[PDB]
């Protein structure tokens, strides 16, 4: 290739503007580049991972530096309940004087932004107290970023390139990751918690210059190597303990108390240290499973080959799957993305109900922002997991080497799978929408007692099995004489039950008929999104409408107007369709979370209990009611500090609307219009002196779908982010 892109000769000879657009859009698709080999593929990916790590380190270093330079961390650690954390300063020449006055918050001397990422609480909990600590953390992170870049450059050199066989040594990598990357890192973290964080919460200041002179525990490694580990749990912090001071401070370093800290409303630090020690032990044990160099361990290939049921109902079982997984990077990426997307939602659901950072729980805006952020990230990752699974079937799947194993039988009964998913989604949608409309009609006619309100009894029974006593079920932990409650009677049940039965935290919130309908809406969204993605993945290789789909690739526009029409027939188009459903589903769960929490923080849960049973309640008491302060950020009488979010609300609306243009109007209309503009330019005096070098053409069919989806998603994210932050920050719950 003589021009750009240099990795695609076919794109380089394109005489239109499309050469540029596509060159940007296919930069990281190394598999489709000119003269590509497997060794080059693996080495390029290995190098790119180092750059991604360097970017991650630089971002954290920037955050730390700006908090230390322009923040109010030292004033915040003395009044966490009454000081607004500062992210960074503002220097905009476009600001007017009222904007300069309105944005001077905290204790700053100029316009600043209030941080809603929760970094202040996280850093305060882990022992950081002064601006110098953040300054020296930022330098270390910059050093790490530089070293990652250096390693990325080094392993690209001729004498340090790793071979393909090294990248395919799954057993050694699994052993090292399970034992070193997971186990040893957790042991180091609990070491930090024992040595710095826990002393820090009791008024002890431990740093690099004195950590070799201070005993983390009075007994000092005696009990550990003797065996009487209980001496590390004897004297925990009292319930009257104040965080950061020695008032009511104990000496224990590893406990099993359960529940929350009375003042900080978060998990005990000793419980966290014990948890990380236990997880480190578990991962260190698990990292000794696979055979590497010493004649002991397991072979994953033999394990997969030996797991064939003798009855023959699974065919050849898992035989041969080791080679398909090991030789396909898309299979590995899909598995990793599915697991990571599951645990991102797990983190989101566990962080709001079991806060781990000091004084996070009563910072409502930060909690809402974090939950929404992590749930939307999980939603995108889960779509990626299915997209790459679909790509695997086209590019890497070998039907002959996978004869009658568990992976071919899925393609065998794809129709049975897709039809049943369709039935489930249809049933859920029909009945949820019907119940919602019935309740709406009853509320319209002035007869709220005719509503169909189903009690979520299964989930209430599960809550009562965890010890909640608001429903009077008396099962398992809610019972007094059972074996389950008797077993943990004196270890963790007291604190856990006290936290669970405390009705002003987010631990097992009371649920009613309003939750039953929204949970089924969430289930319908999940089922429909999985239906779209699974249908796209299982039909990627071909169907009755297009038997030779695998011959055209993962992303192609169509097969033309013949055979009735073939719009959106490629597997990429299934992902493009499923992104809308993922966004809708995540919006539903975030609406539910935000409305359920904003009413609980206001002291009136009954507003949500009665108004969530019909959709007009959602429209009026959640959207309309909570947009009064946001839309008043700037008005003909002045402005306040909420003007940024008011501007971003309309910005997101505008981008969302602009995306509809690319999603509705298609290419030929625009190409025929661009022809006229080309003629007009060629016939205009004093403009004939200027000539284009790339022929102007309309956006491609697939390019326009991507552009419209990007605009749709950007508007969707920005509008809700502005609304959520402004609504939770106008009143602070």
């Amino acid at each position: 290739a003589l021009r750009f892109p240099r990795f695609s000769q076919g794109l380089a000879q394109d005489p239109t503007t499309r050469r540029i657009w596509f060159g940007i859009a296919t930069a990281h698709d190394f598999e489709s580049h000119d003269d590509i080999t497997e060794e080059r593929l693996y080495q390029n990916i290995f190098a790119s991972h180092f750059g991604q790590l360097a970017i991650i380190f630089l971002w954290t270093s920037g955050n730390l530096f700006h908090v230390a330079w322009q923040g109010n961390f030292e004033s915040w650690v003395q009044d966490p309940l009454h000081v607004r954390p500062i992210a960074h300063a503002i220097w905009d020449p476009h600001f007017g004087q009222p904007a300069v006055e309105a944005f001077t918050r905290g204790g700053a001397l100029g316009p600043v932004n209030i941080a809603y990422s929760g970094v202040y609480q996280w850093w305060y909990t882990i022992g950081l107290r002064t601006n110098e600590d953040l300054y020296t953390g930022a330098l270390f992170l910059l050093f790490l970023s530089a070293i990652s870049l250096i390693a990325g450059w080094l392993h690209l050199q001729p004498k340090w390139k790793p071979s393909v066989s090294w990248f395919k040594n799954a057993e050694s990598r699994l052993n090292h990751h399970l034992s070193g990357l997971f186990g040893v890192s957790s042991l180091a973290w609990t070491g930090h918690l024992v040595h710095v964080a826990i002393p820090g919460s009791r008024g002890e200041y431990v740093r690099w210059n004195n950590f070799l002179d201070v005993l983390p525990h009075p007994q000092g490694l005696g009990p550990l190597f003797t065996g009487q580990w209980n001496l590390y749990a004897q004297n925990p912090d009292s319930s009257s303990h104040l965080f950061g001071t020695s008032q009511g401070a104990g000496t224990a370093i590893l406990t099993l108390l359960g529940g929350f800290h009375p003042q900080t409303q978060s998990l005990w630090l000793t419980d966290i240290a014990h948890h990380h020690l236990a997880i480190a032990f578990i991962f260190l044990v698990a990292g000794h499973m696979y055979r590497t160099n010493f004649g002991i361990g397991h072979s994953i290939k033999d394990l997969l080959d030996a797991h064939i049921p003798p009855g023959g109902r699974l065919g050849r079982g898992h035989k041969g799957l080791y080679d398909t997984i090991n030789n396909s990077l898309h299979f590995q990426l899909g598995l990793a993305l599915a697991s990571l997307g599951v645990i991102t939602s797990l983190v989101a659901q566990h962080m709001y109900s079991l806060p781990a950072y000091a004084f996070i729980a009563q910072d409502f805006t930060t909690q809402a922002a974090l939950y929404t952020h992590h749930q939307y990230i999980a939603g995108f990752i889960m779509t990626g997991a299915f997209a790459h699974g679909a790509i695997f079937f086209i590019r890497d799947y070998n039907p002959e080497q996978n004869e009658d194993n568990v992976l071919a039988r899925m393609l065998d009964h794809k129709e049975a799978i897709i039809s049943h998913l369709s039935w489930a989604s249809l049933f859920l949608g029909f009945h949820t929408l019907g119940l919602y409309v019935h309740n709406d009609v009853m509320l319209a006619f002035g007869t709220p007692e005719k509503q169909i309100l189903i009690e979520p009894i299964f989930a209430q029974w599960i809550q009562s099995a965890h010890g909640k006593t608001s429903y009077g079920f008396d099962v398992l932990l809610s019972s007094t004489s059972g074996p389950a409650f008797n077993a943990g009677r004196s270890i963790w049940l007291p604190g856990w039950l006290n936290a669970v039965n405390e009705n002003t935290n987010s631990l097992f919130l009371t649920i009613g008929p309003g939750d039953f309908l929204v949970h089924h809406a969430i289930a319908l969204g999940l089922h429909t999104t999985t239906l779209i993605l699974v249908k796209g993945a299982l039909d990627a290789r071909g169907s009755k409408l297009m038997p030779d789909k695998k011959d055209f690739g993962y992303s192609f526009p169509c097969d033309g107007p013949g055979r009735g029409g073939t719009c959106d027939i490629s597997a990429w188009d299934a992902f493009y369709l499923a992104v809308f459903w993922m966004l809708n589903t995540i919006g539903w769960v975030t609406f539910y979370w935000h409305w359920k929490h904003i009413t609980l923080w206001q002291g009136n849960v009954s507003q949500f209990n009665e108004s969530s049973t019909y959709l007009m309640g959602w429209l009026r008491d959640y959207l309309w009611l909570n947009s009064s302060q946001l839309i008043n950020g700037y008005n003909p009488f002045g402005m306040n500090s909420l003007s940024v979010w008011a501007w971003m609300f309309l910005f997101g609306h505008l981008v969302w609307a602009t995306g509809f243009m690319f999603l509705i109007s298609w290419r030929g209309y625009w190409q025929e219009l661009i022809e006229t503009l080309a003629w007009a330019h060629e016939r205009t005096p004093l403009a004939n002196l200027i000539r284009w070098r790339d022929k102007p053409v309309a956006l491609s069919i697939v390019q326009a779908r991507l552009v419209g989806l990007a605009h749709f998603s950007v508007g969707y994210i920005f509008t809700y982010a502005a609304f959520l932050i402004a609504s939770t920050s106008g009143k602070f719950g």
């Binding site: 003589l2 021009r3 750009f4 540029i20 060159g23 300063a89 220097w91 905009d92 020449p93 070098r693």
Partner: peptide, 29 residues
């Protein structure tokens, strides 16, 4: 001090230099 100098550099000067360089790169040959 620094923001009054750095903000114009990152917001105007650096994007202009990068755009000029990238345009000259993509118009080559």
């Amino acid at each position: 001090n620094l923001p009054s100098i750095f903000v114009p550099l990152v917001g105007l000067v650096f994007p202009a230099i990068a755009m000029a360089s990238l345009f000259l790169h993509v118009q080559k040959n």
